[PDB]
Amino acid sequence: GTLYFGLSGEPSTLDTVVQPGTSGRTVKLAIHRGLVNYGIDGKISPELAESYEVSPDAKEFTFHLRQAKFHDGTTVTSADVKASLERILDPKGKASFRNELSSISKIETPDEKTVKLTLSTPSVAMIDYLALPESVIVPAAWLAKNADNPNAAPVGAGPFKFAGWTRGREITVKKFDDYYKKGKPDLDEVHYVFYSDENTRVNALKSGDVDIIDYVPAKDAADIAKGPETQLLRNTGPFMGLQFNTKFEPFSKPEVRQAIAYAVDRSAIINTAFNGLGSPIFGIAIPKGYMGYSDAKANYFSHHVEKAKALLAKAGYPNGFEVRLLATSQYSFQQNTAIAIQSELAKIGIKVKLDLPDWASRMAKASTGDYDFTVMGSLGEITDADWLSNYYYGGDKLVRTNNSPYFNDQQINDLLDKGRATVDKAERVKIYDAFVDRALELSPLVYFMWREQNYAVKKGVTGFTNMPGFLTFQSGLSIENTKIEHHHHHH
Numbered sequence: 415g416t417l418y419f420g421l422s423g424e425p426s427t428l429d430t431v432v433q434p435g436t437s438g439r440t441v442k443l444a445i446h447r448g449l450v451n452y453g454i455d456g457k458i459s460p461e462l463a464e465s466y467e468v469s470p471d472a473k474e475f476t477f478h479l480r481q482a483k484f485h486d487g488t489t490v491t492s493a494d495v496k497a498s499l500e501r502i503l504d505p506k507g508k509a510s511f512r513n514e515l516s517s518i519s520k521i522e523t524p525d526e527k528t529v530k531l532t533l534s535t536p537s538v539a540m541i542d543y544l545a546l547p548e549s550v551i552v553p554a555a556w557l558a559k560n561a562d563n564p565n566a567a568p569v570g571a572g573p574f575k576f577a578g579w580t581r582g583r584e585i586t587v588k589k590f591d592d593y594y595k596k597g598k599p600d601l602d603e604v605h606y607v608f609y610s611d612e613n614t615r616v617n618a619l620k621s622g623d624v625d626i627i628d629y630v631p632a633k634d635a636a637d638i639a640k641g642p643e644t645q646l647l648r649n650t651g652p653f654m655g656l657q658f659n660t661k662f663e664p665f666s667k668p669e670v671r672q673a674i675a676y677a678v679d680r681s682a683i684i685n686t687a688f689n690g691l692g693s694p695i696f697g698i699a700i701p702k703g704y705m706g707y708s709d710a711k712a713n714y715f716s717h718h719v720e721k722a723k724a725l726l727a728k729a730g731y732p733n734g735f736e737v738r739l740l741a742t743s744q745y746s747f748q749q750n751t752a753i754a755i756q757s758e759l760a761k762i763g764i765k766v767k768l769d770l771p772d773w774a775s776r777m778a779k780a781s782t783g784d785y786d787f788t789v790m791g792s793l794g795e796i797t798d799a800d801w802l803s804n805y806y807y808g809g810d811k812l813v814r815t816n817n818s819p820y821f822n823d824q825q826i827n828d829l830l831d832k833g834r835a836t837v838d839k840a841e842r843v844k845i846y847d848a849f850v851d852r853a854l855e856l857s858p859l860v861y862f863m864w865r866e867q868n869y870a871v872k873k874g875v876t877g878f879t880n881m882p883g884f885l886t887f888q889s890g891l892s893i894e895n896t897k898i899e900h901h902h903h904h905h
């Protein structure tokens with residue numbers, strides 16, 4: 415059988431090292447595999463690495479490669495892993511997670527089936543960063559040939575092979591028979607169809623044109639959950655907030671960032687952008703169960719307009735200032751969150767103008783820091799406490815998909831470095847607790863709410879998993895387990 419999957423947009427690129435957003439990741443996770451990837455239950459799964467060894471100080475890593483092939487019939491070898499990692503590490507390259515993998519200082523290939531990494535500083539989160547959709551392995555010979563071909567047809571080691579891309583319509587993938595997991599994938603093909611207007615996307619599911627859709631809008635969630643011919647797959651992993659370009663003078667000031675945290679009513683965002691679905695955040699967006707979580711620090715901020723006005727005045731803005739907010743019109747919740755922020759900040763004299771291009775245009779600007787501040791709809795990229803480094807650390811790459819451009823605090827860097835180097839979780843928790851105090855004080859990131867992130871499937875679809883908490887954007891991995899009962903589309 416074949417499955418038609420309605421994506422919320424067309425990927426701007428399938429270039430493995432680039433993080434274009436959830437749409438591109440969902441397609442990449444059908445075609446590609448890394449040394450490890452997260453399993454549907456959130457455990458790290460040995461993928462192209464059949465096994466791995468981590469030194470007791472988390473500085474040396476050995477990967478023993480599984481017998482596996484790429485889609486072009488070539489064997490997966492240690493030289494392919496080294497070339498793939500070197501592309502991520504290249505400082506002149508466009509890898510989105512270069513900062514997080516940059517501690518890799520030596521890559522050894524003693525034989526065709528063994529890769530050894532040595533880090534310059536310890537990292538108990540390195541295995542998790544190797545599970546990123548952007549850390550997948552491609553062939554060294556393929557990279558050499560397609561060095562100046564940004565639109566070259568993908569070659570990977572995942573359960574499906576790239577079959578074609580019709581611009582503005584769909585990407586088709588086909589079962590890879592030589593995939594290393596017995597009985598996987600179950601589907602013969604998946605057609606990833608692009609539905610940028612969310613109403614057309616929901617209508618495609620309800621009218622029976624597609625079998626699965628992602629980014630189910632909050633206004634349609636109840637109708638879809640009711641069915642009986644549709645099923646809603648729930649998750650409450652991502653958060654909504656703001657990333658600030660700290661080169662925009664007012665945003666270099668903790669008092670200005672805190673004023674914004676005090677000025678924005680969180681129920682205005684939940685009620686006007688998410689149909690009343692979600693929960694307010696009054697501190698750092700750390701989920702229950704992660705180090706740094708605290709019930710006592712969960713109400714650092716509150717909604718207090720006159721306090722926000724006093725903070726701006728103290729910061730040197732008694733009459734506020736003019737600024738532009740980058741978001742998108744492609745996701746109604748992003749546009750409506752931006753509209754709510756604009757009206758909330760006008761009350762404290764911050765005159766916000768909105769930039770609402772399509773998703774790919776917003777991402778191109780976000781990637782270069784071409785903004786004053788931007789609506790952040792995101793989550794921790796790994797399920798270890800070190801997901802925080804991707805948001806807060808300084809380092810060599812100061813403009814990232816999840817950070818506040820050019821923010822760099824030595825106390826925060828030192829605490830995150832200590833947190834990543836400490837193996838004992840009883841000691842790590844003291845480190846992240848101290849980090850949280852400094853993160854609130856400086857507020858380089860501001861958080862407003864936890865949101866629902868839902869998929870919807872047609873009755874007859876099984877085995878697709880909306881992966882837990884922060885793993886929801888990697889749910890495309892579960893397509894290898896997905897099955898669909900015999901069916902036709904209007905025939």
Ligand SMILES: O=C(O)[C@@H]1C=CC(=O)N1C[C@@H](O)[C@@H](O)[C@H](O)[C@H](O)CO
Nearest residue numbers: 435436745780789790791792815816
């Ligand atoms: O889920 C969202 O809301 C948006 C909407 C499309 C999408 O890919 N999103 C995820 C991105 O916002 C996120 O992966 C990325 O790191 C951004 O640069 C964070 O601001």
Ligand SMILES: [Zn+2]
Nearest residue numbers: 416417418625
């Ligand atoms: Zn179908």
Ligand SMILES: [Zn+2]
Nearest residue numbers: 467476477478
């Ligand atoms: Zn070994």
Ligand SMILES: [Zn+2]
Nearest residue numbers: 416586588603
């Ligand atoms: Zn076909």
Ligand SMILES: [Zn+2]
Nearest residue numbers: 584586605606
């Ligand atoms: Zn098709």
Ligand SMILES: [Zn+2]
Nearest residue numbers: 679680681717
């Ligand atoms: Zn309120």
Ligand SMILES: [Zn+2]
Nearest residue numbers: 677679717719
């Ligand atoms: Zn108010």
